Assembly symmetry: D2
Homo-oligomer: 163 residues x 4
């Protein structure tokens, strides 16, 4: 069964033990940054406070899903407080909303808000035109496999790229 | 006279004509991203809507200061909605608040929120300990001149690094 | 089947035609305020913009549910940006979260944030103690049938008061 | 010297000792709600945490101004996250911004957002038309002395109603 958790599990991974992300920072779950502190103990302290348990740096899938939903809520709130993103989000169906949230997980609300032409196209239901435009971007060149899946989601409005 | 506008003018520059930032994106003023679209016309369209004027891609200092204050307000609001940043911000004086906002301009609220040990030190008024810790960071290594000025601001609570 | 839509339908009503709320303001759906303007035309204009349709002041249940979900998202975001509400919300299960959101629909985030002792009790899983305290409140005296249902939801963690 | 602190001091009062507001709730400073709990001890506990001092329920003017600025920042952030208020606020000068913030202190962001016709008039710089419309409102009838001062501020763009 496909949904936003399974989508972001594919795109960001689901890691139950603390690990270093691509910038060297302690992370867990679905891309959840614990701390920029170089101390593994600091990361474990942040994790234990968040989870309410002495984790030893290892969480369960259900705990990861709790952190993930916290992060989804934060993404949605950033979207709703952003004048470029809110009207697009308001106009989108659940699957395309998941694609927009996916972009926020990757680059943050301000980063997604920068796609001014493509966002306008999405609001206007010009799915393929938006997709063709997004595929020309620096975002796409940097992470083309993920971007292609997210763009297919905008084009089709289905989970087909994740099946 | 030193203040947050003059501080960020030194750290991010004050550019009255549209230019490409370090990621190649059209920007103006004090680090204000206009669009990620590769179209200069798109950037000019965003700018003209924001300013209320047909700018030709060139703004006045006062217009730049208006955009800057919009960006400061956005930074402060992100700080106030972040559980790691809000209590620190609430506890800081104006000058150290400017240093925290400066970090948000550079890396965003979620990025600054990652400095969990240093933030705790700031909340506890352990200025030098926070400064020594921040100077060990990847942030510092990447942009050491700016980081050193911001860290001096946290250590001293003065504008001395910008004089 | 019980859920937050059905809960708030019982507590705030589901009205498909524009009506005046208890303060005389044009409202529709599940307590969704359209405008404080005394003009029915103004209310219809706001509604038509929100729905994307020439409604004549009458919406479908599905349209009402869309507006309702917009309002739920706004409530959750206000909760997450409030230092008194966020840690309680983070700690609660889905059913008790619905009770907290219900209070936000009624009185707003700042209003719910005022229940400082009861909120602490909820965070500590002291359900009955929180419920006994809330039943002593001015909120309860003003709207005792709704408050009793919401308080039962906090006490029991079930939808029993709505069945 | 007139400014937003002095404006709201006139409209909401400046009270250095805990008092009950018009709804019976413990309040201090410039309309700052401490708690809805009927316990004066609870109110004193909230106050002491906010101030960092054992206050005995009495604060200094400077402490009141700190709480006031926290409340101004919260109002501005609510304005900036509201699709009806943000574009108006972005377009207004400092004095008229103070009038909008004043309304948020009184009735909250969602309450001010309800003035859909008057807000449009303000965005269009139709000051007198907005003022004439606001004076017809339930808000005005309920609190006519305050509303008249705030409306004069919108009409004139000066502090004249507070001199
Ligand atoms: Cl759609
Ligand atoms: Cl774009
Ligand atoms: Cl990739
Ligand atoms: Cl300080
Ligand atoms: Cl740190
Ligand atoms: Cl540098
Ligand atoms: Cl629970
Ligand atoms: Cl309480
Ligand atoms: Cl009732
Ligand atoms: Cl103006
Ligand atoms: Cl109005
Ligand atoms: Cl009055």
């Amino acid at each position: 069964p496909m949904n936003i958790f399974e989508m972001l599990r594919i795109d960001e991974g689901l890691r139950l033990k603390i690990y270093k992300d691509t910038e060297g920072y302690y992370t867990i779950g679905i891309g959840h940054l614990l701390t920029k502190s170089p101390s593994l103990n600091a990361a474990k302290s942040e994790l234990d406070k968040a989870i309410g348990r002495n984790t030893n740096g290892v969480i369960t899938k259900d705990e990861a899903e709790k952190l993930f939903n916290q992060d989804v809520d934060a993404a949605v709130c950033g979207i709703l407080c952003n004048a470029k993103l809110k009207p697009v989000y308001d106009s989108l169906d659940a699957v395309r909303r998941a694609a927009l949230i996916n972009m926020v997980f990757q680059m943050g609300e301000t980063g997604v808000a920068g796609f001014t032409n493509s966002l306008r196209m999405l609001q206007q239901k010009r799915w393929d035109e938006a997709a063709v435009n997004l595929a020309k971007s620096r975002w796409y060149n940097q992470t083309p496999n993920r971007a292609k899946r997210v763009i297919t989601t905008f084009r089709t409005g289905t989970w087909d790229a994740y099946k």
